[PDB]
A paper describes a structure:
Viral determinants of virulence and transmissibility are still poorly understood, although lysine at position 627 of the polymerase subunit [name] ([name]-627K) is now known to be important for avian influenza virus adaptation to mammals. Here, we report that a basic amino acid at position 591 of [name] can compensate for the lack of [name]-627K and allows efficient replication of highly pathogenic H5N1 and pandemic H1N1 viruses in mammalian species. Our data indicated that a basic amino acid at [name]-591 can compensate for [name]-627K in mammalian adaptation; interestingly, these two residues are positioned near each other on the surface of [name].
For comparison, we also present the crystal structure of the C-terminal portion of an H5N1 [name] protein encoding [name]-627K (A/Vietnam/1203/04). The [name] protein of the pandemic H1N1 virus shows an altered polar surface when compared to the avian H5N1 [name]-627K protein. The basic amino acid at position 591 fills a distinctive cleft found in the [name] proteins of H5N1 viruses. In particular, the side chains of R591 and S590 in the structure of H1N1 [name] occupy what would otherwise be the positively charged cleft in the H5N1 [name]. Our finding that [name]-591Q/627K (found in human viruses) and [name]-591R/627E (found in pandemic H1N1 viruses) adopt different conformations (i.e. a positively charged, ‘cleft’ vs. a positively-charged residue that fills the cleft and is located next to a negatively-charged patch) probably favors the former possibility, since it is less likely that they would both enhance interaction with the same host protein, but the positive charge introduced by either change could easily disrupt interaction with an inhibitory host protein.
Numbering used by the authors: 540 to 676, 685 to 741
The structure:
């Protein structure tokens, strides 16, 4: 059972079982993250990264539960397998998350689409490494750790910052961030936390 099909089968599995997954993501997340069905995927994620990725993704998911009206189905399904590792707490922001496929790092972009995770809004279908993975059913809460994405660049808040330059922004302060793929968005550092 090679890596390509491990990635494809993992997302097909989340999709086929989304009814119970979604439920458990709200009502018993720990049990969901510990499901054995995520181990194959986990074996592909670089060992040095598994923990930090999981701490990042679980925090983002908690942001999304806490911040009401920001539930994003596609984002949850994308990031979920990275939550399966035991988390190591850290402060780093990630723009992509790696799965190793035969010595080559495939980069899953935290925001929007990539060869490994490509969602088509017209057909309502997910594609993983060119394989069809099945059908799927104003602030972004699961993109940055301890921030919300507000919307488009607002030039009033000054020149954009990269994702590793955000630590000095004051809590509650707003700023423009180079968020990946050349996109600049307005964000806000949260006062509330998890």
């Amino acid at each position: 059972n090679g890596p390509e099909s491990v990635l494809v089968n993992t997302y097909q599995w989340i999709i086929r079982n989304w009814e119970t997954v979604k439920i458990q993501w709200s009502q018993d997340p720990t049990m969901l993250y510990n499901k054995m069905e995520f181990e194959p995927f986990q074996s592909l994620v670089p060992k040095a990264a598994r923990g930090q990725y999981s701490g990042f993704v679980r925090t983002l998911f908690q942001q999304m539960r806490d911040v009401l009206g920001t539930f994003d189905t596609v984002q949850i399904i994308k990031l979920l397998p990275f939550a399966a590792a035991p988390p190591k707490q850290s402060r780093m922001q990630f723009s992509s998350l790696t799965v190793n496929v035969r010595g080559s790092g495939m980069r899953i972009l935290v925001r929007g689409n990539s060869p490994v995770f490509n969602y088509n809004k017209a057909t309502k279908r997910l594609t993983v490494l060119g394989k069809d993975a099945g059908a799927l059913t104003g602030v972004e809460s699961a993109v940055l750790r301890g921030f919300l994405i507000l919307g488009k660049e607002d030039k009033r808040y000054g020149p954009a910052l990269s994702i590793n330059e955000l630590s000095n922004l004051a809590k509650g302060e707003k700023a423009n961030v180079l968020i990946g793929q050349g996109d600049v968005v307005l964000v806000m550092k949260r006062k509330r936390d998890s």
